[PDB]
Amino acid sequence: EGDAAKGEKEFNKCKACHMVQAPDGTDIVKGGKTGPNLYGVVGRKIASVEGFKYGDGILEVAEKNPDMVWSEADLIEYVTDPKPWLVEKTGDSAAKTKKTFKLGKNQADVVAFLAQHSPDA
Ligand code: HEC
Numbered sequence: 001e002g003d004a005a006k007g008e009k010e011f012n013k014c015k016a017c018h019m020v021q022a023p024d025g026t027d028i029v030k031g032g033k034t035g036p037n038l039y040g041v042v043g044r045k046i047a048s049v050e051g052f053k054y055g056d057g058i059l060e061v062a063e064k065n066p067d068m069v070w071s072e073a074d075l076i077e078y079v080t081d082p083k084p085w086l087v088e089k090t091g092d093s094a095a096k097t098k099k100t101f102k103l104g105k106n107q108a109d110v111v112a113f114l115a116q117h118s119p120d121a
């Protein structure tokens with residue numbers, strides 16, 4: 001049972017690279033642009049943010065699984081350890097990505113925070 005209040009704090013480990021900004025430009029969490037905006041990520045098609053330059057592996061996940069979206073379960077796994085998640089979904093041990101950051105605790109909490117800011121999932 002993820003706690004979005006705890007997740008908001010844990011998101012300080014994500015905001016160097018990611019923002020959470022609503023479609024009207026309102027910052028929920030002011031953050032970087034190295035990774036894509038995470039507002040609305042829960043239920044969002046994998047690797048589908050307009051203009052973002054994704055790595056080959058995550059694009060392959062989306063290409064080979066056209067109906068795939070970010071579920072809460074997949075988010076928890078990916079946040080925990082991104083690379084093996086990509087290997088799992090692509091079936092390719094050499095799946096690319098420069099994104100290896102692993103969150104070691106409170107993963108369901110951060111995902112609850114992301115879900116709070118995906119009001120239309
Ligand atoms: C920079 C060093 C990052 C940190 C710290 C975190 N993320 Fe990240 N994220 C980053 C990049 C460059 C990418 C693109 C990956 C690729 O291979 O192209 C991502 C992607 C995500 C995604 C997928 C988004 C999508 O639109 O499909 C998610 C859900 C995500 N990142 C979440 C996330 C969280 C919760 C983090 C803190 C725990 C976090 N990331 C850290 C770069 C960086």
